[PDB]
Design a protein around this ligand. Structure first.
Ligand SMILES: O=c1[nH]c(=O)c2[nH+]cn([C@@H]3O[C@H](COP(=O)(O)O)[C@@H](O)[C@H]3O)c2[nH]1
Ligand SMILES: O=c1[nH]c(=O)c2[nH+]cn([C@@H]3O[C@H](COP(=O)(O)O)[C@@H](O)[C@H]3O)c2[nH]1
Lengths: 257, 257
């Protein structure tokens, strides 16, 4: 039987990052993650500020920020704290453990220094998790494993997906959940986040397919919707965010009973 | 009867980037790609200068450079042209097409502006290739697809690998070859680059495993060895590079017969 976000936050095996997330979701009645896919620091921060009350999480691609500095991230963390949301860097770590450790801690981005959550592809095998965890465990960070993809011709199906779940379950000290299209694990300590979400049917010219918040949360058993263009491209980003929040939240409430 | 690199450079369906690469490999008697896994620009540039004559390609992880600027890349391009090697940014693009085009063209790194070659995981479906090529084709760049990985528990096996090969064949205007452990394509227009290479047997504690140049080039039929710590960790990186070059080159010569 399904526990609320609030109750899942208190589970014995729950990761502290997952717990923080689950509490603010329950408190704010939001299971929406904004995908802030913009190329300017100014717009990133304006959206984070205006939409922060509507969201549980702000997902970034800092490698697309034309004017990235660590100070932009400082400002982002202030908004995260003020409005209460987690920052998820959608880096999709996908190298060998020795390499991803450096990409996570170092370079220009210093992702580990500001990102509550990052994600990884599982294709390299568990060394990818092991490398990230050397940096992320001391910094009290969490990781999401890419179990399925939204895009057309995704190879993250069947046994690949089962491998992702196995890897998460065996690295629960650092791995807090999945990027997936549906519920992939039966353990309620794990989060499921689902991109490829819009209110209306369709896709884009480059392989992306869409499903509705009611489908993903209500029918497919996911926890959080990740929404980019469905919000960012809208004229009124605030009413768009509210629309997605209310959709995903009501879908969750009806699944719960 | 196997074609030399020089003959392959003239193949009717050869990609211009592959052709340029194959011709300098022939000219300089090198099928060594230096994996320049360093965090300081000065060491990067000193290695590229000293080892440039011994290598056909210099592979970078720009996201690990503590003092990255576009000017560092300018200086690297100069050395690349002076010594005749290609620059390969090992970015492992792995998002949906819409995102990867932004990550390739834009952000701080502007990878497409200086990288002859980049690579991609095939997990997202062919959208990842379609995305990169929107940027890459107009800039006369090439892409390598990751068909296999060297690390323990790699899921790039069986149908996953066969999928990578199909995806390359179907996007030959942009895809010039593979990262793999062995020959995966019968078509000689495609390059095979193989990481996880050292003169001695062994591995690291984050899932990396090693095979020799002789095994990789001679027995498994790959074209180019990618060598990081085998060279970088040596006192004399120039003599180390020469050892790897001679090993890989002679293995290639003995395969041709
Ligand atoms: O880890 C992932 N697995 C997926 O299946 C997937 N599909 C889309 N994306 C990323 O999510 C965002 C989607 O943005 P749109 O709502 O604008 O399509 C963008 O930021 C994309 O990069 C994915 N990430
Ligand atoms: O695309 C890839 N598929 C692979 O299977 C693989 N194995 C290692 N690497 C990368 O290659 C370099 C190898 O470094 P070492 O020689 O120091 O182990 C390092 O830069 C690693 O990031 C891989 N890249």
């Amino acid at each position: 039987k399904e526990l609320s976000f609030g109750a899942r936050a208190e589970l014995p095996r729950i990761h502290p990052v997952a717990s923080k997330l689950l509490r603010l979701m329950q408190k704010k009645e939001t299971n929406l993650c904004l995908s802030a896919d913009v190329s300017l620091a100014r717009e990133l921060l304006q959206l984070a500020d205006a939409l922060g009350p509507s969201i549980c999480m702000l997902k970034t691609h800092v490698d697309i920020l034309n004017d990235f500095t660590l100070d932009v991230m400082k400002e982002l963390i202030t908004l995260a704290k003020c409005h209460e949301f987690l920052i998820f860097e959608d880096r999709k770590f996908a190298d060998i453990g020795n390499t991803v450790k450096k990409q996570y801690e170092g370079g220009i981005f210093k992702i580990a220094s500001w990102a509550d959550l990052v994600n990884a592809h599982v294709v390299p095998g568990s060394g990818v998790v092991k490398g990230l965890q050397e940096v992320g465990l001391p910094l009290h960070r969490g990781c999401l494993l890419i179990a399925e993809m939204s895009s057309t011709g995704s190879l993250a199906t069947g046994d690949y997906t089962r491998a992702a779940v196995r890897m998460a379950e065996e690295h629960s000290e650092f791995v807090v959940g999945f990027i997936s299209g549906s519920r992939v694990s039966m353990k309620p300590e794990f989060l499921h986040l689902t991109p490829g979400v819009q209110l209306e049917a369709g896709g884009d010219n480059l392989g992306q397919q869409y499903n509705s918040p009611q489908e993903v949360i209500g029918k497919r058993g996911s926890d959080i919707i990740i929404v980019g263009r469905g919000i960012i491209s809208a004229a009124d980003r605030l009413e768009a965010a509210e629309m997605y929040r209310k959709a995903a939240w009501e879908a969750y409430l009806s699944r719960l009973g």
